[PDB]
Amino acid sequence: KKYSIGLAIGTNSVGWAVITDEYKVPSKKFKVLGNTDRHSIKKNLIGALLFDSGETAEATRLKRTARRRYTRRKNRILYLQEIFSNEMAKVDDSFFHRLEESFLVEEDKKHERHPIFGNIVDEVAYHEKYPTIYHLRKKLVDSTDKADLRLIYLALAHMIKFRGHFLIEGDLNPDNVDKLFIQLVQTYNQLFEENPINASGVDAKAILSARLSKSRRLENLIAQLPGEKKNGLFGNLIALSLGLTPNFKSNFDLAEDTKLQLSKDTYDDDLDNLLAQIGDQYADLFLAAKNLSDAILLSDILRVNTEITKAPLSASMIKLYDEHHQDLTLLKALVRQQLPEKYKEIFFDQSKNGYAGYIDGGASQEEFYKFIKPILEKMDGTEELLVKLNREDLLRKQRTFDNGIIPHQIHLGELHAILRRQEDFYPFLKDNREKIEKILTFRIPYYVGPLARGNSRFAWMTRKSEETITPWNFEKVVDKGASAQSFIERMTNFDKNLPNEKVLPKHSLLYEYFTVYNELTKVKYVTEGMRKPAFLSGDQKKAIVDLLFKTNRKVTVKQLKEDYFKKIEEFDSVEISGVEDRFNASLGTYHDLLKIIKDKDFLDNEENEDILEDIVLTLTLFEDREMIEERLKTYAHLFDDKVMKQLKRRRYTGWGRLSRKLINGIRDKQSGKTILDFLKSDGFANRNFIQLIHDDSLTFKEDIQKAQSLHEHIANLAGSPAIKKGILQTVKVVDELVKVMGRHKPENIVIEMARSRERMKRIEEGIKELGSQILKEHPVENTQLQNEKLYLYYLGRDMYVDQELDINRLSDYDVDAIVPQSFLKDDSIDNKVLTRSDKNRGKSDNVPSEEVVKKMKNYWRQLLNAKLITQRKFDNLTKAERGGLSELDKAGFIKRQLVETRQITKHVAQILDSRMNTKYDENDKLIREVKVITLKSKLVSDFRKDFQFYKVREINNYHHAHDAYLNAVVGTALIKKYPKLESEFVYGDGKATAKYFFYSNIMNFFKTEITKRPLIETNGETGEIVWDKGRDFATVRKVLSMPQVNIVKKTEVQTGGFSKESILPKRNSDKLIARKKDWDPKKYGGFDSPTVAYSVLVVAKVEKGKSKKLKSVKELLGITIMERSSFEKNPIDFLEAKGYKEVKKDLIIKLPKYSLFELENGRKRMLASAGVLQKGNELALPSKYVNFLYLASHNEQKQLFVEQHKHYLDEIIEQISEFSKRVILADANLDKVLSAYNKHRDKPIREQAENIIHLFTLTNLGAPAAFKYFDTTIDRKRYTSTKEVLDATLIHQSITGLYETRIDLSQL
RNA sequence: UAACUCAAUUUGUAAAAAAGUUUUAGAGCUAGAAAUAGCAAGUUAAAAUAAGGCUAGUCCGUUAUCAACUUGAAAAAGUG
DNA sequence: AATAGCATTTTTTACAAATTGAGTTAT
DNA sequence: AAATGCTATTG
């Protein structure tokens, strides 16, 4: 017979259902393979498939890239040791050996146990002399004394091993705050007597370098400068000091929007363009700002002078040490005096987050400071210690989270010192001073990637030499350019219309030309004389470009109607019917090159344009000046420096969507003009790009089609890989159902798809940039930012009257949606305006009145600049003053509310339709045997709420299956009752408020009570009956009442990390796992808690007693992710090695996670691991009870059904008890559930329902979970033994579950 | 459906950084047969950071994909 | 069996591709 | 961001 398919596609569940003609889902009696009593079983063709969320590639990428860093840092140290090799031997036989075995216990050590000197006395003395590595570093930088070759390696290696960041370009130097601010002032002063600025020199070191941020410290630095805008030149010179990218366009009235970034590798190149345009006399402004900006950077990383020591970092680290030494000594005597009884807790007990916990225990700085703060202020004579603790400067370590600020510049400055000292004493240091710096310096560029040799899936570089790559021969042995090119060319699109070809760059002239002449051709004009607006003159367009478009970047219709009509075609008033504002397509690259080339002869002529295409392609391709430099040398012979050196200055972003071939090249023989040249003159047709292709008169739409894997297809979908998993299983589900129907494709298919830590870092960052005074009466809670009344008030200034909404008034203050809930159903937040009242926003029957937009738009551009909300929020917000949600704007919001427009879903549709519709007809046209209907995600949600088919998720997993049914129902109906919409829902080929009245009344044809609808609703053409509100509305009721629903959970081998990542200390346990072959976890610790990949059923024997008497056994052994590859290679040896004797190789059942077992009384179990099970049972509460628990939780007429038919409780609790006692088996907890029910019967009607919905966690399928029953938590009763399963009935489901092989595990 | 303009999320890749943790090294001191007392110290470093693998690279090693049965190296097909 | 503690973090630069949602043009 | 299989301890 005929049938359809419904599908409910989520990230964790594909729901599926089959309906026949009478909206009925058939049963069907499938075989049962295996060795059980059952040969057969009748299942309904409804069900779901559950599965664990698919995951993104980020965690593996972060770890993969982290592992590339570790193996490099190692070779970074190896490069150093290789240098020191031959000379170190002469000093110490095996110094490098003693380091490499540092970690080994004394018992397994080959050399002395003291790594540095190889005996006790020297080593003890080394530490006594230089208590921190920084001491040695400093002393090696200052002292001129010939140093020990081992202490030189140990300073160099420390500087190389942890070498700080590569964020800042160029060479900053410790040249530094107030005495460099005076130089900026005196520079800006003696450039400008006439505009004078002064502040003397007192409070400079603080107002910049205070407790608060860097951006808000410009407001307390620059606003102190009375009669200067901080957004002027001297501000923008203090702006560069903090670390901004200002644009000095206005300041020196320069036409080009010149922007300078100080850390950028482009700044010295960006310095030349501003001085050569402003003069050389203004150099001392930048060359005195970079001094102060340096200061700004160093001022937070180092607390020393540079006048005494040439190692200001290492020195500054010693300073922290000595303060750490003093502050300790003091706090030692201060405890011995006032609280000598609490000395143990603070200095001896590691456990408590005291000092003793701070050092030898796991107490961080933040944790330690939070436990001493109340003991400081109590104990008098600790004034500075609180000042330190409140400045984060109390008892610092030299190795701390906030060492991230130190750039490699600072460490290289010291590494250079040491070498410059000891080369005088060591010949190999003098010769290799280049190499030893370069090991610190060199840094594989991101546009090269893994230095691989055809064995890295991810790599892409090109090898110029095949020899090994070192930091010193890199540019010799790697083709950096070619690699740098391939980095981009392996990601940018091909031409859709010609897949073999590659898209041109978004700023290519030949492209730029095409964009305009496609937008220009359709511009129609009307004057005083003309009677029907005439389209643009094919012949005359070449002037409109040369006159208006080649002249400026932006072409204005206002600057195109006024300039052209009035000065070209003696035309008074100019009305433009094609476009009314600024043109989208600009020739900007023509006006961008014409300023730099200063030749409209070369440009405009274009007798050879192929040279200029490379130039602009190179500017888009690379971002490194160094890369761009060489690449542009090919065309230096035509231009001097100022013409070919400002071309390294120009940089371009983006790629085009169309190739060069298509645009200019692929022509027609009949035509004899390209798509660009045909756009420039099409006579009296002036046809478009989309025209030019598809016009059957032209040969293009053929050429394109004629010149033009499930996993690949699904992979290629743009969408969360989490949804890409539901999509693949959907297609498998479908593939299987079709086979169940004797390989007979369906009539239709209906698809459907659903939709604190982030806050903390976003709010803190925002609170650092804002200057809000949050904290004054807004204490911190890391979690409670998910409070929506708290997140939207804050985001202390209320929206309606532009005042301050109170905390009690923030609960009473309304929250309006940006657009009424009728136009767009969107998450409350990104349209989440809270007003004093709704009566401020205006009429709810459209978008807010112009009056409030006229009123507040001047403030709406003060938070768009602050970037609080997207600019598309301000488009609708300002749409009252722009236009206003018209009766077409509303009809389109009410049409898209039911029609799926999301691209993922369309593809799901394209994929499914393509797979069903394979056969063709007489005239090469496709046969559409199966119709795929995409339905939005609120038809059924309404259909259920409207017609008493309510959903309660908590009860069981049927909702996903039920939805795929309803989705099938509505889908076949809305296609029967409106067949004209098979171009709107199906995949394949005042009147605005009348399209609205269609869309918004489409679903009313189900009803019976609108203000009188007929009983049998029919077709608007055929005599086909489509909905029989008498019969069909009780078949739907019937289906949701069906208790046997096919629920299946994907069986999945586990992948990912070997174990928990925590490196635990040494311990006596076989649960520890060695981090390294010869690293006995008795001695060295390791990991525990490995993830098992899958279990296997071993049937074999094990030796018993000293007799080695084989005793037979049958148990589950967990093959861990790390074990796995070993066990698969040779399962017998792996298992024999485990102690198993005479393994039955035929009986080794592979058991991945979620394997279902049927035990007795239909009690079912899913193995979660070798030694824990989870609830494999699903409870079907009858439909009667479901609708009760929804209303009981929660127009007037069905309320009475709650009070009446009440006490559905007593019978619910029962069904739960009868289930919990049969399959769950959590005696104590079911006795606490009952015991807590009976003592809450005097609690309201709703409350008892709200806790029964909490009760289903007990009976829910999957892992036991804790849950509350009123004010009584109920700890999870887990299943921590698989013994029972070993003699149960392993069930092998098919993806639907309709096919089963059941194996009774009474093997042995 | 296509190009176009403007501004948000999602996905994928590469290059870098700072910590954390683990063992060792940094002679603890007296008093006591010992348990235990008193006190002195404490900030640093080396090395490991998936076990590892062969393709031996300054590469690869945590994504995706997985009922059963028969057939296939696999992909996949066939089976009610 | 009931019971309880446990889980590696954070930061920067560079690029590409779709999507979504406000506009002009056309098939 | 929880959520849930390890780990160990208990009478």
SS3 annotation, A70-131: HHHHHHHHHHHHHHHHHHHHHHCCCHHHHHHCCCCCHHHCCCCCCCCCCCHHHHHHHHHHCC
Count the neighbouring beta carbons within 10 Å of the beta carbon of residue A498.
17
DSSP A73: H
Q: Which nucleotide is nearest to A892 (CA to C1')?
A: C21
Distance CA A1062, CA A1165 (A): 31
Please name the residue whose C-alpha is nearest to the C1' of nucleotide B21. A1063
Chain D nucleotides close to protein (CB under 7 A) are 1-8
Distance CA A779, CA A1237 (A): 39
DSSP A263: S
Estimate in Å the CA A574 to C1' B5 gap, whole number. 24
Main-chain phi, psi angles of A703, to 5 degrees: -45, -45
Q: Are A1110 and A1104 in contact (CB under 8 A)?
A: yes
Estimate in Å the CA A121 to C1' B35 gap, whole number. 34
Name every residue whose Cβ is closer than 8 Å to that of residue A493 and which is 6 or more positions away in sequence.
A502, A503, A655, A657
Q: Which nucleotide is nearest to A1065 (CA to C1')?
A: B22
Q: Which nucleotide is nearest to A718 (CA to C1')?
A: C18
Distance CA A422, CA A769 (A): 47
Estimate in Å the CA A761 to C1' C11 gap, whole number. 12
| CA A396 vs CA A155, A299, A317: distances in Å | 21, 17, 9
- Each residue of A1048-1057: b (16+ CB within 10 Å) or e? bbbbeebeee
Please name the residue whose C-alpha is nearest to the C1' of nucleotide B19. A401
Chain B nucleotides close to protein (CB under 7 A) are 1-8, 10-27, 39-69, 76, 80
Q: Which nucleotide is nearest to A1077 (CA to C1')?
A: B51
- Each residue of A1265-1298: b (16+ CB within 10 Å) or e? eebebeeeebeeeebeebeebbebbbbebbbbbb
Query: What approach was used to elucidate this structure?
Result: X-ray
The pair of structure tokens assigned to A67 is 């592992």
Estimate in Å the CA A1150 to C1' B72 gap, whole number. 20
Distance CA A1046, CA A49 (A): 8
Distance CA A877, CA A862 (A): 14
Please name the residue whose C-alpha is nearest to the C1' of nucleotide B59. A452
Distance CA A871, CA A876 (A): 9
Q: Are A805 and A811 in contact (CB under 8 A)?
A: no
Closest CA to A1103 of A1116, A1112, A1090: A1112
Count the neighbouring beta carbons within 10 Å of the beta carbon of residue A406.
16
- Each residue of A921-940: b (16+ CB within 10 Å) or e? eeeeeeebebbbbbbbbebb
DSSP string spanning A1164-1222? EEEEEETTEEEE-------HHHHHHHHHHH---TTTHHHHTT--HHHHHHHHHHHHIII
Q: What is the CA radius of gyration of chain A?
A: 38
Q: Report helix, strand or coil for A619.
A: helix
Q: State chain A's maximal CA–CA distance in angstroms.
A: 117
Q: Which nucleotide is nearest to A63 (CA to C1')?
A: B62
Estimate in Å the CA A819 to C1' C20 gap, whole number. 17
Estimate in Å the CA A1279 to C1' B71 gap, whole number. 39
Helix (H) or strand (E) holding A931: strand A931-934
Estimate in Å the CA A337 to C1' B18 gap, whole number. 39
Q: Which nucleotide is nearest to A1294 (CA to C1')?
A: B67
The pair of structure tokens assigned to A492 is 């940018």
Chain C nucleotides close to protein (CB under 7 A) are 1-4, 6-27
- What are the helix (H) ranges across A889-958? 889-895, 903-916, 939-946
Estimate in Å the CA A313 to C1' B52 gap, whole number. 39
Please name the residue whose C-alpha is nearest to the C1' of nucleotide C18. A718
Q: Report helix, strand or coil for A822.
A: coil
Name every residue whose Cβ is closer than 8 Å to that of residue A1063 and which is 6 or more positions away in sequence.
A1075, A1085, A1086, A1087
Distance CA A700, CA A495 (A): 14
Closest CA to A306 of A296, A293, A295: A295
Distance CA A185, CA A198 (A): 7
- What are the helix (H) ranges across A225-311? 233-242, 267-278, 283-301
Helix (H) or strand (E) holding A409: helix A408-422
Pairing of strands A3-9, A748-751: parallel
Please name the residue whose C-alpha is nearest to the C1' of nucleotide B75. A709
The pair of structure tokens assigned to A45 is 């063709």
The pair of structure tokens assigned to A1049 is 């959970």
Q: Which nucleotide is nearest to A59 (CA to C1')?
A: B62
Number of residues that this document lists for chain A: 1308
Q: Which nucleotide is nearest to A115 (CA to C1')?
A: B25
Residues facing A819 on adjacent strands: none
The pair of structure tokens assigned to A1231 is 């006795």
Distance CA A111, CA A1264 (A): 54
Name every residue whose Cβ is closer than 8 Å to that of residue A607 and which is 6 or more positions away in sequence.
none
Q: Report helix, strand or coil for A68.
A: helix
The two counts, helices (H) then strands (E), for chain A are: 54, 29
Please name the residue whose C-alpha is nearest to the C1' of nucleotide B47. A103
User: A227: alpha, beta or left, given left = phi > 0 and alpha = psi -120 to 50?
Assistant: left
Q: Are A1099 and A1286 in contact (CB under 8 A)?
A: no
Strand D CB shell (< 7 Å):
A 756-758, 783, 1067, 1069, 1071, 1088-1090, 1092, 1118, 1168-1172, 1174, 1262-1263, 1265-1266, 1276, 1278, 1280
Q: Tell me how far the alpha carbon of residue A340 is from its chain's centroid.
A: 53
Residue numbers after which chain A is interrupted (C to N above 2.5 A) read: 176, 708, 755, 795, 989, 1011, 1194
Estimate in Å the CA A1061 to C1' C7 gap, whole number. 8
Closest CA to A396 of A405, A407, A388: A388
Torsion of CA A116, A117, A121, A126, to 10 degrees: -50
Q: Which amino acid is at A75?
A: N
Distance CA A1169, CA A1278 (A): 12
Distance CA A191, CA A178 (A): 20
Q: Which nucleotide is nearest to A760 (CA to C1')?
A: D1
Q: Which nucleotide is nearest to A1059 (CA to C1')?
A: B50
Q: Which nucleotide is nearest to A1262 (CA to C1')?
A: D4
Estimate in Å the CA A825 to C1' D9 gap, whole number. 53
DSSP string spanning A295-347? HHHHHHH--S-SSS-S-HHHHHHHHHHHHHHHHHHHHHHHHHHH-GGGHHHHH
Estimate in Å the CA A246 to C1' B19 gap, whole number. 33
Q: Which nucleotide is nearest to A783 (CA to C1')?
A: D1
Q: Report helix, strand or coil for A614.
A: helix
What's the number of CA atoms in the CB half-sphere (13 Å) around residue A197?
25
Please name the residue whose C-alpha is nearest to the C1' of nucleotide B54. A455
Closest CA to A17 of A28, A7, A27: A7
| CA A319 vs CA A232, A295, A298, A393: distances in Å | 39, 19, 15, 11
Residue with tokens 């009384």: A1161
Count the neighbouring beta carbons within 10 Å of the beta carbon of residue A23.
23
Residues facing A839 on adjacent strands: none
The pair of structure tokens assigned to A439 is 């090991």
Question: E-assigned strands of A477-533?
Answer: 494-495, 498-502, 525-526
Resolution of the model in angstroms: 3.0
Count the neighbouring beta carbons within 10 Å of the beta carbon of residue A1231.
10
Q: Are A188 and A285 in contact (CB under 8 A)?
A: yes
